[PDB]
């Protein structure tokens, strides 16, 4: 099978800047009929893939002229001029020349924006959940950049390392930020045996952790 | 108006099969190829196979020998893929795509999520996330302990969307948990109701949670 290797794997690029994506094939991808079926596709977060370019460098109708392709032999390049937020997602090359047809592994395009501190919010368990014997404390770390961040939980001042469940969004093109949810779950019984619950977010935008907390007796 | 409309999410069992549908409209079904493309969670794309509904020709991928059979009903302009001998790692989103010799995969269906698991369908619990003492206010909903994906979550029936963050579901044991936050002007809430609306098609569950202050 034709191996299609994309570099870089991850591509942070500022708004308005140019980006280039390389797609190398383990072998030639000229079909017997003379055509080179090298195509480029963009998959935005949570969407179906979109055709950008076919036969190496023909732009598909409806695709902005900012996308263009080149290459020959075993190295093909997608260029993005004047990157826009809507361009973020994963770019795939694809060969439809030799069986089986194969995609590249994909290139993650990230919008590189100004650093943004997380907006941190904390939420106690609902009474409804307590009824089932479990108790979830939720922390939102919203609209931060870059994606690198850590969340830590503390109960009555001491670090709690079990019961934690974390979820990370993909980058939001609305403002090129990331968000993250952390849920700390324990038994209702243990939840009621403590007073203070704290989540702490550590991010490059602050020398000190960002702290949000509540007391059950507040 | 070219459209490829795919069937809804599936829960398939290990060792079993599932048939996916892809109904074409807005063009002549039998004038183009039709490919299926698979995509695993946090993984890239993979071509499964192609059939030409006009001629009945099938382009095969040996990697899917005994795992995929492609058919088509010319009458209803609908393409099918039968995925068999399923295992857990066949869990993926499956797309259909109109496939032309001039341009390639120019049009794609919206994708069908296929979960392969022996776990039972479980309805979600939906819990309100009411803020505590701490210019804008952020509220949320916690959607806990459901299976399989997907759920849909909206705020005030879709009216609020600009301040919303919905997070990807995380699987723990055989149950998913998801959360969603909504940020609004401190003047809006609580002097204005904010409600998260959750649907879990697999269990025909709908749940509303009005966010009330503590
Ligand atoms: N034989 C080939 O190279 C291609 C692959 C699928 C059909 N034609």
Author numbering:
A (entry chain B): 1 to 218
B (entry chain A): 1 to 134, 139 to 218
Which sentences from the paper describe this structure?
MUC1, a type 1 single-pass transmembrane mucin glycoprotein highly expressed widely in adenocarcinomas including pancreatic cancer, modulates cell–cell interactions by altering the O-glycosylation profiles in its tandem repeating domain (TRD) composed of 20 amino acid residues. It is well known that cancer cells express a high level of MUC1 tandem repeating domain (TRD) modified with immature O-glycans such as Tn (GalNAcα), sialyl Tn (STn, Neu5Acα2,6GalNAcα), T (Galβ1,3GalNAcα), and sialyl T (ST, Neu5Acα2,3Galβ1,3GalNAcα1) antigens. SN-131 (clone 1B2, IgG2a) is one of the anti-MUC1 mAbs created on the basis of this strategy that binds MUC1 TRD with Tn, T, and ST antigens attached to the immunodominant DTR motif (ESI†). Despite extensive efforts for the development of many anti-MUC1 mAbs as potential candidates of anticancer therapeutic reagents for over 30 years, to our knowledge, SN-131 is the only antibody that exhibits specific and strong binding affinity with cancer-relevant MUC1 TRD modified by Tn and core 1 type O-glycans such as T and ST antigens at the Asp-Thr-Arg motif.
To decipher the structural basis in the recognition of MUC1 TRD-ST by SN-131 antibody at the atomic level, a pure Fab fragment of SN-131 was crystalized in the presence of synthetic MUC1 TRD glycopeptide 1, a heptapeptide derivative Ac-Pro-Asp-Thr(ST)-Arg-Pro-Ala-Pro-NH2. The crystal of SN-131 Fab complexed with MUC1 TRD glycopeptide 1 enabled structural analysis at 2.06 Å resolution (ESI†). The overall structure of the complex showed that the MUC1 glycopeptide 1 is bound in the antigen binding site of SN-131 Fab, which is composed of the amino acid residues in CDRs H1, H2, H3, L1 and L3. The crystal structure analysis uncovered that the O-6 position of the GalNAc residue forms two hydrogen bonds with side chains of the amino acid residues in CDR H2 (His52 and Ser55 of the heavy chain). As demonstrated by SPR experiments (ESI†), these hydrogen bonds contribute strongly to the dramatically enhanced binding affinities with MUC1 TRD-Tn (3)/ST by SN-131 in comparison to that with non-glycosylated MUC1 TRD. Notably, the side chain of Asn35 in the CDR L1 forms a hydrogen bond with the O-9 position of the Neu5Ac residue of the ST antigen. This is the first 3D structure providing evidence that anti-MUC1 mAb interacts directly with the Neu5Ac moiety in the ST antigen attached to the proximal threonine residue within the immunodominant Asp-Thr-Arg motif. In addition, the binding between SN-131 and MUC1 glycopeptide 1 is stabilized by the interactions of the MUC1 core heptapeptide moiety, Ac-Pro1-Asp2-Thr3-Arg4-Pro5-Ala6-Pro7-NH2, with amino acid residues involved in the CDRs. As represented in Fig. 3d, the aspartic acid residue in the MUC1 glycopeptide 1 [Asp2 (MUC1)] forms hydrogen bonds with the main chain of Asn31 (H1), Gly101 (H3), and Thr102 (H3) in the SN-131 CDRs.
